[PDB]
Every structure is written in structure tokens, then in C-alpha cells.
């Protein structure tokens, strides 16, 4: 039993306009099935923003605000669900995170580290990111943004927090992002808890980004906000 | 200058679980560009529900609640939104609609008519739908649900209503719904205003739906709510 | 029981280079299952060439050579298939065709008629095509090329000709062509035999072709040759 | 300047039938552009067959025969490649190969080694493959078949051999395979020549393969033969 997510995000392009991409994510728990209180269908509203940038994109500081909900709207049918209610004690309201990243984008190899802090229950976080190997990146940094934190989703409407419940075992995610110009970037990730710090271990592998298109030429200017739909399966 | 939308909807399956599909929509105005007050990026939360169904799905009555917004969430940067403010006079707060649909799904041809009423500014509406030809359909009616009214979106927060402003000329849409099991359903549509009634004319052409998959075997059970991301281009 | 095909075609672009698209076709028979001699997996090599063009693309003349085969190459295992042998009699070795087409591409409506002749068993044909409505098209004619004749495939090596067997009842196809820049074009089609003439009925519904991309700007120069992979299911 | 490829392969299923997937590959040379003799558009017919299998798939011995061509078919126009002609001294007619592979498929990690030999100019090769970590795999070995050899393509008809020309520098490839049931498997690979042996280094990352589908349940039975379409870009 896991959660699958789906999003369509929009990339802002130099000169106006946008490039769309599609996110198919599968969220897997390391905690055993019997001990989880599974949600029903729900949505997470994010806004992901580039705060600071230095050195041809080899240093980037990212902020994110994530908030989960159920459909607020009244329903002529009986899907109040609703339901809800989850509590997660290992996660304090002030948490620190450390991350390591490694992968390839169009045959170009690179490594990244980051450290950050945020407020899980409030739905906010920040990430200070270093490109350590294979900088300057020849591709728009934006495409890695979604790969740097499911724990910091503010589940307010009682909705069961599938990510915060998982600890200490942890959770993984694995995602395939599909740009409409042809590019494809898959990423696998491990979230674990050691001494009260959240440890992220990612692996990027992207291919087929058009060479004379916005991603490789770096004509991008951050993302718009987005809605992820999340739903349980098998 | 027009609006493109992107949504991912979830289809409910007999036995739990879901089949996801992707909606790429282009909304075009018949009113001239200069006379339109274009919105910025925004989102529409819908909930579409089958009220009544009779005769192996040859009569179906649908209700929808659509509410548009901007990102409520605070932004570290200065994308205040909120701009806004649009007024559209031809659309009263009680509207009636009449519809004709014709198209093919996996070589099987069919025709539909419908009539309904709803409250545009409140975001609510109802549709009473008849299969007048080629019923009973060998496919789940659900896949047509999204093809029957952009005017009944409650634009509050002072978001410019691209759909209402358009009147009297009217507007069209054209969409490609892409199921993850392989099916593909495109639709072209014309909206227009004649004697204070909203007139819909649709055309469907769906192909490649697996014969032994949920859609053809009719093992589906309505949609979950969804979020559409609407954005201006060219 | 029917045949599915898959092709990837390449579009020649003004200035060198190519735009790839994907063809998913389902070919369905009108003749009863028991009286057909089903093929195995096999391949069709085509080369489609614009012989003539006049009037801003409102007259186009097409030649096609199609030849189906099985893998000639030796197999370490014993896949023979192999098999083969079909004869089809309603189809003479000189056939004439008449075709009608109607559909939409990015909200622009149009109709086409054509007449042509070829040698089915030899795998050749020509088509003389008139745009009778909604010319001049604001889009590259190329994208319609693949919608104007399955009967004229030279099945050598003894492969059972699934298309020639169908007569007199006839057969349909229905296809989704998916460009990598985003455009999508589906087409459903009906074949039949009336008075020794082959009668084609096509319908087009294409959407989402980027306005500032090759297809809408007409910066194309025909297709490259292609291989279609044909295989039976249900 | 490099080569892109496109294929559609068919996977054989327990109980008959097939699951199709799409291959987008980009082939990059490590040898400098001025010294390469680029091909034109062309095709490769392969047949990949599992010879032996032992220990729940932890040992697989693979055979491949690859033969490249242009379009044998006559053209009503001036397009005859034909050109062709390439010579590659460093590659003998009996070559040896050693490979290391590492990656993840649906959150499951694994490593593979293989060694093999074949006749590059004749277009044949064999691979003896050992699963060295994380066996037995919970997924159909098939989805890995295409990741173990571009040097052993028999370029007849005189097509300039882009893979053999690269030596000694070597070449990389990177590919995205997209199943129609939802799975996605990208792979990056490094080829090189050291002491007269071909050295392969692969990395796999497959995701979003359906849990209740053929690949994960191991209901597969090898590939059908296939055609890849190769074309130059940049
Ligand atoms: Mg969405």
C-alpha cells in the first residue's frame, strides 16, 4: 500500500510563455502496512520559489510552502471523507535536513549537497544548495528543483499524514517528469531519520532534453505554483 | 492570446483503485484580443458527480461545482497576484443551456443532446443528458463527462473571467485527454449565445482504448475532484 | 480479433533536422473472426512521397510504396512464423479508389476529396487530392499525408493479407499520431467495396500543435521512409 | 553532431498478446566532429533472443543479430542516400566485451556483470549475464534486454558506421523506454576500448511500472524482432 501523485507544473520562460511538464510520483513507505492510517484522495498546493542565486547557478537557495487539503467544495453526493486525523511524534515542529544528490542529465554528470530547515506542520522549508562536481551546469537548474521534501506538507484538514507517520523507518519516492518538448527526468529518493535530522538521498537521470530548447539553453525563470493530486493504491 | 489548461483527473474503478488521465486544453476566444482583460496564472477546483443514471447509461444527469482562485499561499517573492476585476453583463446569474454532441469512440458512432441550468457566478450547474443514437454505448459514460461549460466558474478574488467576458461572440475549446492505459479522447467544442441561452456544440473522437481494460468493460465509477491550472499564451 | 500497428515517422524540417511523431493504429475487421487467416508479428516498409503540389497546398498528389515482410534474419530459437499464404479475390490487380475526408486541426475546419489508382499486390498507389473547403490550410499538409490505404500492401513471403481478406464487408482503422513537440492527431476511417471501387471515409481531429512550431508555420518538407510493426490481439 | 534513434518493440506475454513500448535513444560520440563520417537516415532490423536462463533469471545468455540498411524501395524522387562507406581499423572481426551494470527498478536496487563475444561486421553477438546483487529480481528480466551493444551492427549497403568510427575515444548512449501500461525505464551507458576489449558501463533507472501488471508479475516471454530508425541531428 502506497500513495501515487500526479502534477502538471509550469516552467516560466525568458520572453513570456511556459513549458509544461507532467509528474507521475510513487510514494512508498518503509513502515509496515498494518500500522499506517491511509488517507483518501487529496490535493497539495505548493509554491516553489528561487530565493537566491550565485555562481552561474552552482549555488541556489530554494523556499517551498506546501499545503494539503480535501475538496472544500460541497458535494451533492456523500463523500464527506473527510475522515482524517494523524499524529506523528518523531517529527518536531522545527526540523533540520541534509541532502546528497548524484545523477546525469543528457550525458553530463554532476553532484549536489544541501542543508536546510523548515516547519513541517506549518508547511514551509528552505534549502541551501551546492553544486559540487560538474558545475557550471549546462542545463537550467530549475529541472532539479522538485528533487530536493514530503515531510513538510502541512496536513491541516486532519487528513492523515502518510509521510510523517512513516518515521523512523522512513519513506522513498520515485518520479518521472515528462516535459512536453521531449525531455524526461526520472529520480529516485530515500528519506530516513538519524539523530533527529532528515537525510535525503537522491539520484537523478534525465534524458532527451532538446539541445536547442529552453532547458539546455537556460532560458527559464522558475516555476509557477502547482497542485499535486495524491491517492492510495495496492 | 488564449488560455491553455492542464489537469490530471482520477477515474474511480470497480474494486477500488484508479485510472489516471491527462487533460491538455486550449481555450480560444471569439471576442478580439484588445477587448479582453487577460488573467494571470490561476487554478480551478472542480467536483463533477453523476446524480442520476437510467437505461444502461443512455440517460445521465450531471452536477458540477467549479471555483477559480489564485494561489492563496504567501509568496517569499513579490508575485502579489492578485490584479483582477472583471465584469461580464450578458451572463445573468441564472442561465439555461442546450447541447448537441456527435463523435466516435473506438469505431462506435453515437449522438447526444442535453439541456441544463446553473448559477455561473456561484460556480454550479446541472446537465440532463440523453443518448439519442447508438445506445447502449459499449463504453463507460464517464469518459464523456468532461465534454459537456466554462462559463459556470465562480471567479472570486477578482480574477478576470475569460469565458464570460467573451460574450456575445462566444468561445471554443479543444482538448486531448490522455489515459495512462492507452486511450486518447480529443474533443472540439463551440460555445455561443442565442436569445439568452447558452448553446454547446461538441465533437468527440476517441481511439485506442484497450478492449479488455476498465473503460470498455465499464468497470468505472465516476470521477474524483480535480484541479485545472489555467494559463495565458500567444 | 484484430491487428495493431506502431510506427515512428520523421518529418523533414526546413533547415535540416527532423520532428518525430508516433503512430498508434488499431485495424479492425468487418468480416467474421472464423473466416480470417490471422498473420503473426510482421513489418511494413513504406516510402511516402509528394509527387506534386499546386495552389498553396490545395492540390497534392501522393505516391506510396508499401512492402510487408517477416524478419529475414536468422533466429537462434525456433520462431519460424514463418507460416503464411493468403489469396484475396474481390481485389483485382488493378484497383481504383475514391475517398472523402472531413475534420479539424487546431480549430480550423476543412474537407478533402481524392481519387487514385494502384497495384495492391505490387504494393504501389497514387492519390490525387483536392482541398474543397477551408483552404488555404494554415498548417503543413504533411500532417494529413498518412490519412489518405491499407489494401495496397505487397504481402510477400506468404504473409496472410488481413486487409484483402476482409472483402466484401470491408475494414476500419483508427489511429493516434503523437508529435514530440505536442501536437496530437487522431483519425478514424472506414473502408468498403462497392462496384469494384474501394471507398474510403476518413475523419480527422488534431489538436495542440504549437503555434510557433513547424507544423503551423509550414516549415516542413515531407516524411522520411518508415517501418510499421503489425501484430494481432483480441 | 550525434545520432538519435527511435523504435517500437513488442513484448511477448504469457497467454499470447503483447505490451508495446517506445524507445527514444541519443547516441553521442567522444571522437571530435570533423573526423566522423555521418550517416544519413537509416534503419536497423534486430532480433534479440534469450538463449539460456537459469536460477530464476539470475543467469541469462543473450544473442543479437543487427543488420542496418537504407530504404531498399524505389523513390519517385531524387533521394538515393546512397553514399555510404566507412572503415574502422581498431575493431577486429572477433571482439570481446565486458560489462558492468547498476540501477533501480521500482525502488528495487541491483547490479549485473556480463561478458561476451561477437562479430561486429557480421552483426552478431552474445552476452552471458550474471545478476550479482539483489537477485532474484522481482521484475521481468526482459526490460533490461536492450541495455547490455552498438558496435556489433552489420552496416551493409555502405552506411557510414557511426559507432565503429568513434574508436578509440568511444561513444555514450542514453535512452528512455516507455511502456504503454505506464512503466518508464531510462538508461545511460558508456562504451570504451581498452587493450582490445570493449568495456561497457550501464546505469538503469526504471519507475512507475504497474504492480499488478506483466513486468512486475514476471508474465513475459521475450521480445519480437524490431526496427529502430536512426537519424543525425545538430
Ligand atoms: Mg493539476
Q: Which residue has the cell 515512428?
A: C8
When computed from its CA atoms, the radius of gyration of chain A, rounded to whole angstroms, is 18
Helix or strand run (H / E) with residue C217 = helix C214-217
Distance of alpha carbon C169 from the chain centroid: 19
CA distance D70 to D146: 22
Bridge partners of residue C199, in order along the sequence: C98
CB-based contact D162:D38 (threshold 8 Å) = yes
CB-based contact B189:B147 (threshold 8 Å) = yes
Helices assigned H by DSSP within D101-213: 162-165
CATH code: domain of residue B145: 2.40.155.10
CB-based contact D15:D159 (threshold 8 Å) = no
Ligand 1 centroid to Cα of residue B70, in Å, is 13
Count the Cβ atoms, other than its own, within 10 Å of residue A73.
Answer: 16
Grid cell for residue B217: 468493460
Nearest to C5 by CA among C171, C193, C200, C180: C171
Grid cell for residue C108: 480550423
Q: Verify whether the Cβ–Cβ distance B205 to C203 is below 8 Å.
A: yes
CA nearest to A104 within chain D: D188
Method: X-ray
CB-based contact C108:C129 (threshold 8 Å) = no
CB-based contact B192:B31 (threshold 8 Å) = no
CA distance D205 to D188: 9
Ligand 1 centroid to Cα of residue B143, in Å, is 18
Q: Which residue has the cell 514530503?
A: A150
Mapped onto helix, strand or coil, the DSSP state of residue C165 is helix
CA nearest to C185 within chain B: B186
CA distance C75 to D64: 9
Q: Is some CB atom of chain B closer than 8 A to the CB atom of D182?
A: yes
CA distance B125 to B95: 9
Q: Is D72 exposed, middle or buried (0-12, 13-18, 19+ CB in 10 A)?
A: exposed
Helix or strand run (H / E) with residue B176 = strand B171-179
CA distance B201 to C110: 17
- C207 → closest Cβ in B107, B186, B234: B186
The angle subtended at Cα A98 by Cα A148 and Cα A159, nearest 5°, is 60
D91: Cα within 13 Å, side-chain hemisphere: 28
CA distance B153 to B69: 10
Chain C residues 27-56 with CB within 8 Å of chain D: 41, 43, 45-47, 49, 51
Bridge partners of residue C62, in order along the sequence: C50, C127
When computed from its CA atoms, the radius of gyration of chain C, rounded to whole angstroms, is 18
Which residues are CB-contacts of B16 (< 8 A; sequence separation ≥ 6)? none
Distance of alpha carbon A77 from the chain centroid: 33
Q: Is some CB atom of chain D closer than 8 A to the CB atom of B180?
A: yes
Minimal C-alpha gap between C8 and chain D (Å): 7
Residues D138-151, buried b or exposed e (16+ Cβ, 10 A)? Answer: ebbbbbbbbbbbbb
Chain B residues 205-234 with CB within 8 Å of chain D: none
Q: Which residue has the cell 459556470?
A: B152
CA distances from B190 to B60, B153, B171, C207 (A): 22, 17, 6, 15
Count the Cβ atoms, other than its own, within 10 Å of residue A44.
Answer: 21
Nearest to C172 by CA among A232, B109, D39, A58: B109
CB-based contact D211:A234 (threshold 8 Å) = yes
CA distance C182 to C172: 26
CB-based contact D57:D222 (threshold 8 Å) = no
CB-based contact B28:B171 (threshold 8 Å) = yes
Q: Which residue has the cell 524526461?
A: A184
CB-based contact A80:A72 (threshold 8 Å) = no
* Resolution to one decimal, Å: 3.0
CB-based contact D18:C231 (threshold 8 Å) = yes
CB-based contact B150:B64 (threshold 8 Å) = no
Q: Is some CB atom of chain A closer than 8 A to the CB atom of C182?
A: yes
Q: Which residue has the cell 587493450?
A: D195
Q: Name the domain count of chain D.
A: 1
CB-based contact B36:B162 (threshold 8 Å) = yes
Query: Which one of A182, A207, A214 would you mutate to disrupt binding with C, by most C Cβ within 10 Å of its Cβ?
Result: A182
Bridge partners of residue B199, in order along the sequence: B98, B192
The angle subtended at Cα C131 by Cα C130 and Cα C135, nearest 5°, is 150
Query: Which one of A8, A15, A181, A207 would you mutate to disrupt binding with C, by most C Cβ within 10 Å of its Cβ?
Result: A181
CA distance B86 to D81: 60
Residues C158-174, buried b or exposed e (16+ Cβ, 10 A)? Answer: ebbbbbbbbbeebbbbb
Nearest to A45 by CA among A141, A157, A140, A142: A157
CA distance A179 to A208: 10
Mapped onto helix, strand or coil, the DSSP state of residue B86 is coil
Mapped onto helix, strand or coil, the DSSP state of residue D50 is strand
Nearest to B9 by CA among B174, B234, B226: B226
Which residues are CB-contacts of A107 (< 8 A; sequence separation ≥ 6)? D26, D28, D172, D174, D188
CA distance A182 to A177: 10
In chain C, which residues have their Cβ closer than 8 Å to the Cβ of D6? 8, 10, 20
Distance of alpha carbon D175 from the chain centroid: 9
Q: Verify whether the Cβ–Cβ distance B207 to C184 is below 8 Å.
A: no
CA distance D204 to D196: 26
Q: Is A222 exposed, middle or buried (0-12, 13-18, 19+ CB in 10 A)?
A: middle
D156: Cα within 13 Å, side-chain hemisphere: 10
Minimal C-alpha gap between B179 and chain D (Å): 10
Distance of alpha carbon A87 from the chain centroid: 22
CA distance B114 to B98: 6
Cis status of the peptide bond prior to C136, with omega within 30 of 0: yes
Task: Say how many Å lie between the first and final Cα of chain D, rounded.
Answer: 5
Minimal C-alpha gap between A10 and chain C (Å): 15
Helices assigned H by DSSP within chain B: 142-145, 162-165, 214-217
Beta strands in chain A (DSSP E): 2-13, 18-29, 42-54, 59-69, 95-105, 108-119, 124-133, 154-155, 171-179, 184-194, 197-207, 220-223, 226-233
Nearest to B109 by CA among C151, C166, C190, C200: C190
Kindly state the DSSP code that residue C55 receives in the 8-state scheme.
T
Task: Say how many Å lie between the first and final Cα of chain C, rounded.
Answer: 4
Which residues are CB-contacts of C191 (< 8 A; sequence separation ≥ 6)? C150, C151, C163, C166, C170, C171, C172, C173, C198, C199, C200
Nearest to B103 by CA among A30, A118, C188, A143: C188
In chain A, which residues have their Cβ closer than 8 Å to the Cβ of B72? 45
Bridge partners of residue D130, in order along the sequence: D59, D113
β-strand pairing of A59-69 with B18-29:
unpaired
Distance of alpha carbon C106 from the chain centroid: 22
CA distances from C134 to C58, C105, C109, C183 (A): 9, 11, 6, 20
CA distance B77 to B98: 45
Distance of alpha carbon B73 from the chain centroid: 26
CA distance B228 to B4: 10
Which residues are CB-contacts of D4 (< 8 A; sequence separation ≥ 6)? C20, D24, D25, D26, D27, D230, D231, D232, D233
Which residues are CB-contacts of A66 (< 8 A; sequence separation ≥ 6)? A44, A45, A46, A123, A125, A152, A153, A154
CA distances from A115 to A62, A97, A170, D213 (A): 11, 6, 18, 39
Please give the backbone phi and psi of residue A67, each rounded to the nearest 5 degrees, phi first.
-130, 115
CA distance A151 to A66: 10
Helix or strand run (H / E) with residue C145 = helix C142-145
Task: Say how many Å lie between the first and final Cα of chain B, rounded.
Answer: 4
Count the Cβ atoms, other than its own, within 10 Å of residue A210.
Answer: 17
C85: left (phi over 0), alpha (psi -120 to 50) or beta: left
Task: Say how many Å lie between the first and final Cα of chain A, rounded.
Answer: 5
CA distance B228 to C52: 45
CB-based contact D132:D115 (threshold 8 Å) = no
Per-position DSSP letters for B35-83, written without gaps between them: G-----SEEEEEEEEEEEEETTTTEEEEEEEEEEE---S--SSS-----
Minimal C-alpha gap between B170 and chain C (Å): 14
CA distance B72 to A225: 10
CB-based contact B148:B61 (threshold 8 Å) = no
Which residues are CB-contacts of A99 (< 8 A; sequence separation ≥ 6)? A112, A113, A114, A115, A116, A127, A148, A199, A200, A201, A202
CA distance B47 to B49: 7
Chain C residues 86-125 with CB within 8 Å of chain B: 104, 106-107
β-strand pairing of B2-13 with A184-194:
unpaired
CA distance D37 to D58: 40
Which structural domain, as residue segments, surrounds residue C195? 1-234
Per-position DSSP letters for D194-230, written without gaps between them: ETTEEEEEEEEEEE---TTSHHHHT-EEEEPPEEEEE
- C224 → closest Cβ in D4, D41, D226: D41
The angle subtended at Cα D102 by Cα D59 and Cα A134, nearest 5°, is 160
The angle subtended at Cα C184 by Cα C178 and Cα C189, nearest 5°, is 90
Amino acid at each position: 500500500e502506497f500513495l501515487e501523485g500526479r502534477s502538471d507544473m509550469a516552467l516560466k520562460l525568458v520572453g513570456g510563455g511556459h513549458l509544461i511538464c507532467n509528474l507521475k510520483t510513487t510514494y512508498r513507505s518503509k513502515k509496515p502496512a498494518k500500522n499506517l492510517k491511509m488517507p483518501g484522495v487529496y490535493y497539495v498546493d505548493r509554491r516553489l520559489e528561487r530565493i537566491k542565486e550565485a555562481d552561474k547557478e552552482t549555488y541556489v537557495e530554494q523556499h517551498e510552502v506546501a499545503v494539503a487539503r480535501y475538496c472544500d467544495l460541497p458535494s451533492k453526493l456523500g463523500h464527506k471523507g473527510g475522515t482524517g486525523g494523524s499524529m506523528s511524534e518523531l517529527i518536531t515542529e522545527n526540523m533540520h535536513m541534509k541532502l546528497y544528490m548524484e545523477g546525469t542529465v543528457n550525458n553530463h554528470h554532476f553532484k549536489c549537497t544541501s542543508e536546510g530547515e523548515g516547519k513541517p506542520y506549518e508547511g514551509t522549508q528552505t534549502m541551501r544548495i551546492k553544486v559540487v562536481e560538474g558545475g557550471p551546469l549546462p542545463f537550467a537548474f530549475d529541472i532539479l528543483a522538485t528533487s530536493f521534501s514530503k515531510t513538510f506538507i502541512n496536513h491541516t484538514q486532519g487528513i492523515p499524514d502518510f509521510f510523517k507517520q512513516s518515521f523512523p523507518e522512513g519513506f522513498t519516492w520515485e518520479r518521472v517528469t515528462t516535459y512536453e518538448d521531449g525531455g524526461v527526468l526520472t529520480a529516485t529518493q530515500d528519506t530516513s531519520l538519524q539523530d533527529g535530522c532528515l537525510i535525503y538521498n537522491v539520484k537523478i537521470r534525465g534524458v532527451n532534453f532538446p539541445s536547442n530548447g529552453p532547458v539546455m539553453q537556460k532560458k527559464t525563470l522558475g516555476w509557477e505554483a502547482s497542485t499535486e493530486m495524491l491517492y492510495p493504491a495496492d
